[PDB]
Amino acid sequence: NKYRDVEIRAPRGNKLTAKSWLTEAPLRMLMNNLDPQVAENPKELVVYGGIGRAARNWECYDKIVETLTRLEDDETLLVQSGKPVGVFKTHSNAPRVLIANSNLVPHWANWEHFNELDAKGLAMYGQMTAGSWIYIGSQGIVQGTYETFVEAGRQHYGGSLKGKWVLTAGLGGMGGAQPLAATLAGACSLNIESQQSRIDFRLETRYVDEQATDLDDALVRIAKYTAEGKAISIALHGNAAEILPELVKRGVRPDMVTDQTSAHDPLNGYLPIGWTWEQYRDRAQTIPAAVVKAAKASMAVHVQAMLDFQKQGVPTFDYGNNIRQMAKEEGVANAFDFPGFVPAYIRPLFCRGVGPFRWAALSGEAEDIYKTDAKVKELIPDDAHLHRWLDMARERISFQGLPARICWVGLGLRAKLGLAFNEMVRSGELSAPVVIGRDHLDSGSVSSPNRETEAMRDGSDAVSDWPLLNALLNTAGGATWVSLHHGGGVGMGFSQHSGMVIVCDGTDEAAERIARVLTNDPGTGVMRHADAGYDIAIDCAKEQGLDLPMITG
Amino acid sequence: NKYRDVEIRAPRGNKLTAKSWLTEAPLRMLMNNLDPQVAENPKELVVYGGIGRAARNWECYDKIVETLTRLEDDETLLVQSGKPVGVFKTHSNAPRVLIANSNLVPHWANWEHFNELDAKGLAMYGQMTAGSWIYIGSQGIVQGTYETFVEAGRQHYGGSLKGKWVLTAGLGGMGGAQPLAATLAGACSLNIESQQSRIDFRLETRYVDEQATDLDDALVRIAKYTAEGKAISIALHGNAAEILPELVKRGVRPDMVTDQTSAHDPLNGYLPIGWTWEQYRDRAQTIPAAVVKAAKASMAVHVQAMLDFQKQGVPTFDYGNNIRQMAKEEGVANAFDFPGFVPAYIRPLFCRGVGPFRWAALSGEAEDIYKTDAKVKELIPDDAHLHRWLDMARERISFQGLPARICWVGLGLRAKLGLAFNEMVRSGELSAPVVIGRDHLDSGSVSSPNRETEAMRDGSDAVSDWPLLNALLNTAGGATWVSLHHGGGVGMGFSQHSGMVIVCDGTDEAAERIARVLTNDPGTGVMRHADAGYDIAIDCAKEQGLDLPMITG
Amino acid sequence: NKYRDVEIRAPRGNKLTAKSWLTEAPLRMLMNNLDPQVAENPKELVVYGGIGRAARNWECYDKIVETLTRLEDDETLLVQSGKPVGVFKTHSNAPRVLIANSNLVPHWANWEHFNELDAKGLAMYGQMTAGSWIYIGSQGIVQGTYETFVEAGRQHYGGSLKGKWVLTAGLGGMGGAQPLAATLAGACSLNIESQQSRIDFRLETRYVDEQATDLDDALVRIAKYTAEGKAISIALHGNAAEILPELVKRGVRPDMVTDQTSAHDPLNGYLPIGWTWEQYRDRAQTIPAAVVKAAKASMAVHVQAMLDFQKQGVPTFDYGNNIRQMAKEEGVANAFDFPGFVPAYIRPLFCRGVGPFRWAALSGEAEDIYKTDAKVKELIPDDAHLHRWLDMARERISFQGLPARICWVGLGLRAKLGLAFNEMVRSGELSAPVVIGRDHLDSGSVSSPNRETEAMRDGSDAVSDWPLLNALLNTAGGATWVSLHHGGGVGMGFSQHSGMVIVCDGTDEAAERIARVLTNDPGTGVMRHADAGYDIAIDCAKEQGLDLPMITG
Ligand SMILES: NC(=O)c1ccc[n+]([C@@H]2O[C@H](COP(=O)([O-])OP(=O)(O)OC[C@H]3O[C@@H](n4cnc5c(N)ncnc54)[C@H](O)[C@@H]3O)[C@@H](O)[C@H]2O)c1
Ligand SMILES: NC(=O)c1ccc[n+]([C@@H]2O[C@H](COP(=O)([O-])OP(=O)(O)OC[C@H]3O[C@@H](n4cnc5c(N)ncnc54)[C@H](O)[C@@H]3O)[C@@H](O)[C@H]2O)c1
Ligand SMILES: NC(=O)c1ccc[n+]([C@@H]2O[C@H](COP(=O)([O-])OP(=O)(O)OC[C@H]3O[C@@H](n4cnc5c(N)ncnc54)[C@H](O)[C@@H]3O)[C@@H](O)[C@H]2O)c1
Incomplete structure (x- = not known):
């Protein structure tokens, strides 16, 4: 139904409820989205923004959890505006979940029609990270x-x-x-x-x-x-x-x-x-x-x-x-x-693929995040401002639900970090796997002419091919779950954007996916801004050896 | 320019700057409109009522003064939105000045277009008595x-x-x-x-x-x-x-x-x-x-x-x-x-042609006004209300610039007073000529559905033929200056109205003009309200022997 | 009353119905406006334009005729949207008739309000020459x-x-x-x-x-x-x-x-x-x-x-x-x-006061117009286009009602022709007086931003001070009747314009008024266009010795 008097919290430690870490991860992060410490109104499945939900309704939520719990590593669940609609055969290097929320054919992409669909049980507003299970408060x-x-x-x-x-x-x-x-x-x-x-x-x-x-x-x-x-x-x-x-x-x-x-x-x-x-x-x-x-x-x-x-x-x-x-x-x-x-x-940062790199410890241990904080400082030694953020996040930012962290890192360094985290899971330095994701607001993952893509130098503000290509490429690259949402932040009609999360479970097959995904994800942002003709992005592409046919040949 | 750091004051006494009293009169009343004791902001040509001005700008002011000084008794100066635009041959029994201020073709009769024209040097707001030189503080x-x-x-x-x-x-x-x-x-x-x-x-x-x-x-x-x-x-x-x-x-x-x-x-x-x-x-x-x-x-x-x-x-x-x-x-x-x-x-007063009838002593002598106060009482000996008005005026109303008097009288009495004052000028009882005028707010001189003609009994609120006829008739009759203004009182788009002033210089020629002009001017007001079917106006027209073809035959 | 099954035609010859030729003139030209040969629908008082009327209704028509017949040479009739509303004392050198038709306070100057007023018996559309009695078919x-x-x-x-x-x-x-x-x-x-x-x-x-x-x-x-x-x-x-x-x-x-x-x-x-x-x-x-x-x-x-x-x-x-x-x-x-x-x-012509000079033979005799045609040729001998038009007119243009003629004549020549016609009346060359007028579409007599004042070089399109001053000046100058109309040609809200007609009765007194009016009327046009900064107008003003204070001092 609509309301349930329950408290939901992500399972902790190393015991699996699902069949592997690839399926345990989205299950834990969905439940984390509904944590009383994290969510705005989780008894109505609201994560944030008043109506940004993790699932369409309680029957959908129940079935998502059920399905994730029995999903195999060669199967992919489709979530359609918060409803588990189908499970199909893919493979272990594809995402376990593909999520498309709140998407409406443009002529009908408005709150009035959304409300009409909602009345008919056909709708859920995913916002950005509400419907795509990577919200950290x-x-x-x-x-x-x-x-x-x-x-x-x-x-x-x-x-x-x-x-x-x-x-x-x-x-x-x-x-x-x-x-x-x-x-x-x-x-x-x-x-x-x-x-x-x-x-x-x-x-x-x-x-x-x-x-x-x-x-x-x-x-x-x-x-x-x-x-x-x-x-x-x-x-x-x-x-x-x-x-x-x-x-x-x-x-x-x-x-x-x-x-x-x-x-x-x-x-x-x-x-x-x-x-x-x-x-x-x-x-x-x-x-x-x-x-x-x-x-x-x-x-x-x-x-x-x-x-x-x-x-x-x-x-x-x-x-x-x-x-x-x-x-x-x-x-x-x-x-x-x-x-x-x-x-x-923000855009000059986006030009270098610098965007909000987000991770969470599935174990629930604060120490796992403190260990990753220290690893980040180690691998990025010369950046004083990053060090300051990490120093005071520990002191002044309280964890909510699963301990998590955000910092801004760019093309090249995202993969370096993800691989190090993966090696830390492998070595046992981290007590359990970690997930790496982001908000939907990153260099190559959002079209929003009133916000993130306002006043593109070439006038391409409204081109939304980019987040769609970003989601397709992250699916091809091996993210654990991939999302396409409409209307996050600015409402129906005004944005299209993509999400991805990838689990680092310490295996080399994960490492291969991590290397690809954490290169390609910021890479699409550098590409997008290089395409618009931003010199910073063009220079970044050349420095990192990105293959951009119309620029680098 | 619209600012000049000067004090303007009407010349006083019996010495002429202009060629005659018919031309001295508008010169003195224009200057009186700008007297620092009279006007709200005269260094910017502003008399009252927002930006009600006496002349378009200082170059126009200078040229009006210059032109009135040389104007002959058989010539007429045209003033177009505070600018002296032409002098043409007429005769001594026509007005010396014809003024049309702020008039705009109806579709463009709004403050936005006025302001556009003002910025181009093409506009001046006449208000009512600001642009037509009969403001007395x-x-x-x-x-x-x-x-x-x-x-x-x-x-x-x-x-x-x-x-x-x-x-x-x-x-x-x-x-x-x-x-x-x-x-x-x-x-x-x-x-x-x-x-x-x-x-x-x-x-x-x-x-x-x-x-x-x-x-x-x-x-x-x-x-x-x-x-x-x-x-x-x-x-x-x-x-x-x-x-x-x-x-x-x-x-x-x-x-x-x-x-x-x-x-x-x-x-x-x-x-x-x-x-x-x-x-x-x-x-x-x-x-x-x-x-x-x-x-x-x-x-x-x-x-x-x-x-x-x-x-x-x-x-x-x-x-x-x-x-x-x-x-x-x-x-x-x-x-x-x-x-x-x-x-x-106020309407029942308008029905009898009663309104803001006024006069000013061109001599500058307070005693000239006191003499007129006494004469009014002599001619209207039984009106307790009017006698008390005049007593309170003497006690409590301070002269501003040229001594002047407000005294609400209607059809019949305006000409009686006018003719008596002219006799006093001829006899030397008054030390110099007086001017007789009114606000443009008066029974026959204004159409204004949100003010003077609000809720006419026959629904004729917006009919503006009447003030136009009043100005044409005042011209035919021999007023010394006649005005047609738009937007006075209620702003652009909302009124059309006329003004008149006549000089009592003591001559038999002036007497003849006074007799008809001061009959006709309130006469048009009685006519206008009689047309609308007001019985007070109809009875007043009959008492005064007005010739109203559709009413009296 | 709205419809009357009658034929109306102007009286002919030298026999007067009215008291003089000053009052016979408007009477005849009013009836001429309704001639079956001239008017579109005269049984409903419609002259042209479907609803352009000569009088508001039949009771008003009757009373206009009756009033004109008894009007003295020192009296003036006021006509208010086709209704004879008042008769006031003026003098023989003022107009016998002052006309204001269809004028509405700007905010209400639209057909919807006109129609509301019309339904209450308060309105008449005067077009241009329909309500001002100078239409010649x-x-x-x-x-x-x-x-x-x-x-x-x-x-x-x-x-x-x-x-x-x-x-x-x-x-x-x-x-x-x-x-x-x-x-x-x-x-x-x-x-x-x-x-x-x-x-x-x-x-x-x-x-x-x-x-x-x-x-x-x-x-x-x-x-x-x-x-x-x-x-x-x-x-x-x-x-x-x-x-x-x-x-x-x-x-x-x-x-x-x-x-x-x-x-x-x-x-x-x-x-x-x-x-x-x-x-x-x-x-x-x-x-x-x-x-x-x-x-x-x-x-x-x-x-x-x-x-x-x-x-x-x-x-x-x-x-x-x-x-x-x-x-x-x-x-x-x-x-x-x-x-x-x-x-x-047309505007280059207006700059020289060249506009549509029109006149009609009150006698009804075609020979009168042919004599004036020859007189115009005589007094303007070197203009081949004028001579061509007049020759063309006799053979190709049929008289409708009273024989009348239109000619484009500018500042200087208008008065020359008018004084000449007057002398022909005096001498008996013409069998009866002639009237001289025009359409309201003349150099100084119309403001109409979508037509005659479109794209004034100074942006003054909508300034309507000008036709108002023209009407006031023609009243002061001695025109026989003067008109102020709203909405002619372009409809409610879109134009304001003035008319004048002057009778040439052969007297010395008419000559004095003709010399004034026929100089002043086109003169205001040269003035208006000189004010806007047209070189042709400025040059013409200087050639004719016009007194334009801001141009010539
Ligand atoms: N582009 C982005 O990514 C981005 C990021 C942050 C905020 N914003 C924009 O900032 C605005 C605020 O966002 P929000 O979610 O906080 O909205 P909100 O409505 O919760 O907050 C607005 C606050 O402004 C206060 N306020 C209103 N008028 C004020 C005034 N004259 N003086 C002082 N305070 C006043 C209100 O009381 C309210 O608390 C929105 O337009 C949002 O789109 C955009
Ligand atoms: N009813 C009548 O017979 C009649 C006659 C003449 C003028 N008027 C109208 O009267 C109005 C005033 O004329 P005026 O000559 O005094 O104009 P003005 O411009 O000289 O004075 C207006 C006054 O309003 C004050 N004011 C403006 N906003 C205010 C506010 N929010 N609170 C307090 N005070 C404020 C200004 O400081 C100023 O002193 C105009 O609209 C004018 O057209 C009516
Ligand atoms: N500014 C002026 O002084 C002035 C002078 C003359 C005409 N006009 C304008 O000219 C227009 C015509 O005036 P009117 O009174 O003759 O109007 P009208 O409606 O009587 O005549 C218009 C004619 O156009 C014909 N027509 C329509 N579409 C046509 C087409 N595609 N091809 C050929 N013919 C077509 C119609 O059959 C009709 O006979 C109006 O807009 C009027 O305002 C203005």
Whole structure:
């Protein structure tokens, strides 16, 4: 059915429930997706995003578990929007599970039709990692936001963020990660949020350190903590469209400026200048046209302030909330004089196949992750920023469900790491096999013109051949499970993306798959960006000896 | 350019700059429109009502002055949106100046197109009396506002406003008359104004009594003064769109609610919620589309509060700034649930041709006006209301620029007074010629479905043949200058209206023009309302012996 | 009352019904507007355009006639949308009648509101000359279309069209005038029309000389008639969007290309390529959206052919049917590479105040018009095109109602001719007074951004100050009747325009008014165009000694 009063947790240790580690792995990771410590609403099979599910319904979940438990190494289960629809003969070097969730023929790819199918029992929103069984809790968004701040810090500031501060807004579902990410990057931050209840939540969870009493107090604290070389996040109850222009007027100069207000939704996600929250919600019901106009006017003012910071040379960037387009429509003709965070910071990383390399210890032992943390530092010895992340993840990131880790590593190094992990399983240094996967947001695995593929230099934003080729190639290469999803992050109609996870069980046959998959997966991202004509990606392909017929011959 | 750091003042006494009194008169009244004691912002050519200007720019101003100085009595100057465009041969019994300001082919009659033309040097907003040179400071409207308050008192409060108070906003050139009008009607008043300089101006010219320190203070004063039976006006520095909703929330109940902010022009005349006046003016230059959106959204909130007051039983009306229209456009579907002041209170006066009839002493002598006050009482000896009006005017209305007088009289009496004043000029009782005019708000000179012709009994609100005929007839009859303006009062798209001024220079020739012009001008108003089937107007036409073919034969 | 089974004709000879010739003139011209020989549907007071009326209804007509009959020379009648609303004292040098028809406050200036008012007995569409009593039948449109073709000939072909041919389409209400106008101008013409019934009509009335059997036949006839120096009009039954592209393909070069299909109305007025008229009418009922697209697509093809002609040096012009706009919306990005006929040909004439000078013999005698024709020839002896037109008019243009004539005459000559006609009345050369007027389409008397003021060089298309000033100035100057109309030609919302008519009764007093009015009326046109910065207008202003303060000091 829809609701079940149960607690689900991944089996631990070395005892198998399934027939091998190739099938035990997806089984454990599915169950991990539903862990009370990991999942948002697992009693309704919700992993995250309110309706991002691990399985279509409880009958489907039961049958997936049943089927995985008896699946042979020469068989492949097909999961179709969270339903186990078929088992077919393949071989041990093919994936054990092939997953396609939420895919709709384009003309019908909208929430209205999704809802119609849902009513008929035909639907499940997979988000990214909800339906594809590789979600590891808040570490994803925390590490991800950390990467943006750290990369911006590498580009502008030589990786030296001590005594520097980030100015931003929004402490919501995604924005709440900003203060912690900044702190971990080594920066102070001032975080503007219009709902006190969201500040309270982020204070309670220690994502934000302190709340200032007012703007003057906020600035005193920032000046204090930066002078002392501390990395402390500060929350301020207020309105970014009021505070940012005031900071410009006062000549206050932050070291980075961004924003995570929900400016994509003027009716519901962006408080107009001068309004309480309060007035905003009340007026949204009675005069929605006026509210949208008030919010949009306020965004123009907000973006003018962001542009003013950039004119003073402050690294300034959009954090995917559509605020620049909103402002532009209001006559801020130069709204796009500051870039989106992906084109500015993430894409150059994607050009080198650097993306969010994610792994989990199937044993459940924290020590297995600590051992892999140490291995990563050993194999990548000269990279100080990676070492800092791994040092403070142990100190400041709590495991949720199965101990897991994310770090950003590129073409060449992904395979090096995966093979080392595999050798560690073989040697018994790791107590049980590990899985290596990622979010669906990687260099060669996503098409999303409003986000990850916005403003491709060749205008190819909407080309979705790439994630489809990525999934086909990872199937051919030997990933343990491969996923194709639609509409993760941005909703029905707006993205297509692929996932893969591979088990490292210490065998040489795994090593062969690992070598292929962990070369090919980032390799497709280098290819994709080289195809668009990015010099970094072309140079990376040549350095790594990638075979790109139209570039390398 | 539209800024010049100069003080403009009407020449005084009997020495002529122009060739005759027919040409000296418009020269002096143009300059009087720009007198620092008269105009809201004369260094930018702005007289009142948002950006109501006296001339298109300073080059145009200079050329108008130059041209009027050389104009012959058989010549007519054409003024086109504040620009002197042509001089043509007519005769001494035709107007010396013909003015057409702000007129746009209907499909293009909106603020967006006006602003485009303005940016090209092709436009000027005439308002009503700004572009047609018959503005006399806050006195021009003060009797109208007074008659409105008094009539509302008759309908709602048994003819007594003692112990009652008005809530309103806008202390600009015309809005500044509200506090004094309320006082003269016997009511206390709370008047919200966003610019300290405007409060200062009203304080300086004795139009408002005092300024409260905050809203709480204002409310205690209102409660005390009303309990004492006093009639004292109170200015409060703030934003009506913030204060009115707050007052609704607190359950505060004024005895009347209206508004006279410059809502007719969202870009220039109405301060958005949460904005300073400085931010408003700066942003109007850079992001005008956002500014209009913010102002209109704020008007929606403002009108919602006015509607809440009305639902609580508070007498509520639109005082002629088109605010209901602006709110309706933004989703306030019931914006017109409260009426305009004309259909509610003033129309029966228009039916008799009674309106904002006025005159000014070109000599600059206060004693010339006092002499006219005395003559009016002599000629209208039995009207207690009018005698008291004139007493209160002498006691409480400060002259601004050239001494002038507002005095609401209708068909029959306008010519009687006009002819008496001309005799006083001939006899030397008046030291120099006087000009007789009116606002364009008058019985026969305006079509405006959201103001002067709102809810006509025959549904003829939008018929604008009438003001055009009025201007043509005033030209045929021998007014000294005649105007046809678009958009005065209620903004672009919403009105068409005419103006007239006639000089009483003491001659027999002027007497003949005065006799017919001051009969015909209110005569067209009686005709217009008689056409619509108003019995008061029909009875008035018959009493005065008007020739109305479809009514009298 | 709406319908009256009567025949109305202007009184003839020298016997007065009214009190003077100043009031006899408008009376006769009103009745002439309803002559069975002149009016489209006079039993319902319709002069032209289906609903362009002389008076609002029969009661109004009766009262207008009765009032004019008793009107004194020092009195002025106000006509308000065809209704005699008031009579006021003026003087003998003011107009006897002031007319304002169809004027609506801009926000309500649309047909839906007009219709609402009409249903309440409050409305009348005056068109241009229907409500202002100066319509003289088909001579207006025939002469006007003639002037376009003649002016094009002057600009491109040294003022000779002999051996030349015009290619156009549309033989409708206005388009039907094309073949006759081309013939009179001295050119051959090929006229494409999709309805055989329309061709039949024009063949019967001799507007079109002959019908070709097919395109090849048409081309054989054109080659022959042009080679023989004949001016013969040829109709071709077909589709302009099929024929014009075929002519381009064949390498055929006409000497002028224009179009008067009803492209402004894709659903009803423009036959799609490959469709029969029956298919078009049938499909308009079942699939109107598809019909509109087929027609719009066909317009794109048609305009492509017109551009192909222009690229070859063929004088090509839009004849006010919106076709360029329609094609542009379909991806013909250079659709405005050919001009409208006004900007190209009529506007240069307007710059010199050259416009359609029209006059009528109140006597009813054809000899009166023939005498004035000869007088015009005498006073303008060196203009061969003028002489040709007047000779052409006598032989090819039939009088309708009162004998009347149109001539294009500019600043300086208009007054010269008017003073001369007046002297002929005085001397008894003319058997009775003549009226001098015009269409509302003259240099200083119309604002109409989609027609006569399209693409003003300064962007002032929509400025309607000008016709208003023209009306006011003609009232001041001494025209016999003056009119302000809205919506003529282009409909509610899209134009504002003025009329004037002046009687030449042979008196010295009329001469004084004629010298003024006939200088001032075209003078305002030169002024308007000089204001816009047209060198021709500025040069003309200086040559005629016009007093334009911002140009000449
Ligand atoms: N492109 C990406 O990968 C990416 C990553 C992170 C966030 N985002 C974007 O950031 C936006 C926020 O995401 P979210 O999930 O946190 O949304 P959310 O709705 O949970 O959070 C928005 C927060 O902004 C606050 N807010 C609204 N108006 C404000 C104002 N004027 N001043 C201060 N605070 C205000 C709201 O109270 C809310 O807490 C979204 O548009 C999201 O798409 C995009
Ligand atoms: N009813 C009538 O007879 C009549 C006559 C003349 C003018 N008017 C109309 O009256 C209005 C005011 O004319 P004016 O000459 O005073 O204009 P103005 O532009 O001189 O003054 C407008 C005033 O409104 C104040 N204001 C604007 N927004 C405000 C807000 N949100 N809260 C508080 N104050 C605010 C401004 O600071 C300014 O002082 C105009 O719309 C004008 O067209 C009506
Ligand atoms: N701007 C001006 O002053 C001016 C002057 C003359 C005409 N016009 C414009 O010209 C157009 C015609 O006016 P009208 O009153 O004659 O309209 P109308 O509807 O009477 O005539 C249009 C004619 O076009 C014919 N037609 C339609 N599609 C055709 C096609 N594909 N091929 C050949 N013939 C086709 C119709 O059969 C009809 O006879 C209108 O848009 C009018 O506004 C403007």
